[PDB]
Structure formats: structure tokens, C-alpha cells
């Protein structure tokens, strides 16, 4: 049990830190939403009256 047994955990922590500090410097820009539309209807059979 030496400093070599901590290598995998060291890599786990290093990957977490790399992701975290690459998220900080990444530039973020808003995007335009162009998908709004009322196209989600439902079908079926009409309940026609009889008489």
C-alpha cells in the first residue's frame, strides 16, 4: 500500500477537475428557438349521433 494504489482515484479526480474548469472558460451564447408550432393533434373516430 503506497502512493501507487491512489493512481486510479487520482485520475478520477483529475478528470472531474478538467471537466469542471473547462466548463468555466467555455464561451456560452444564446441560441434562437425556431421550432414553435401547434402540430400535435390527436385522431380517432367520431361519435356520430343516430336517430
Amino acid at each position: 500500500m503506497a502512493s501507487t494504489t491512489r493512481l486510479v482515484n487520482d485520475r478520477k479526480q483529475l478528470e472531474q477537475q478538467v471537466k469542471d474548469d473547462a466548463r468555466i472558460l467555455a464561451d456560452a451564447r444564446g441560441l434562437n428557438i425556431t421550432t414553435v408550432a401547434n402540430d400535435s393533434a390527436t385522431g380517432g373516430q367520431a361519435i356520430r349521433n343516430v336517430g
Binding site: A46, R48, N49, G51
Partner: protein, 41 residues
């Protein structure tokens, strides 16, 4: 003379499968009609 009505029943059932739209429940716009009117003074 026994199968003369079997064909009728089969044709009635088959045409019953041809779906037909019904306006029985649907109404439409309308206007009052103007009646001939002569007025003088």
C-alpha cells in the same frame, strides 16, 4: 330463390363499411332573406 337475399345482405354490409361523413350535428352560417317591400308617402 334461397340465396337471392344473401347477396343483398352481403352488399348492404359491404356498403356499410364505406364510411360516410355526417353533418347531422354540424350547423352553418345563415342570413335572413329580404322580402319584397313597396312603401310610399
Amino acid at each position: 330463390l334461397d340465396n337471392v337475399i344473401k347477396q343483398i345482405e352481403a352488399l348492404s354490409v359491404i356498403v356499410n363499411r364505406s364510411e360516410k361523413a355526417d353533418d347531422a350535428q354540424i350547423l352553418g352560417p345563415n342570413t335572413y332573406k329580404q322580402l319584397l317591400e313597396h312603401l310610399f308617402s
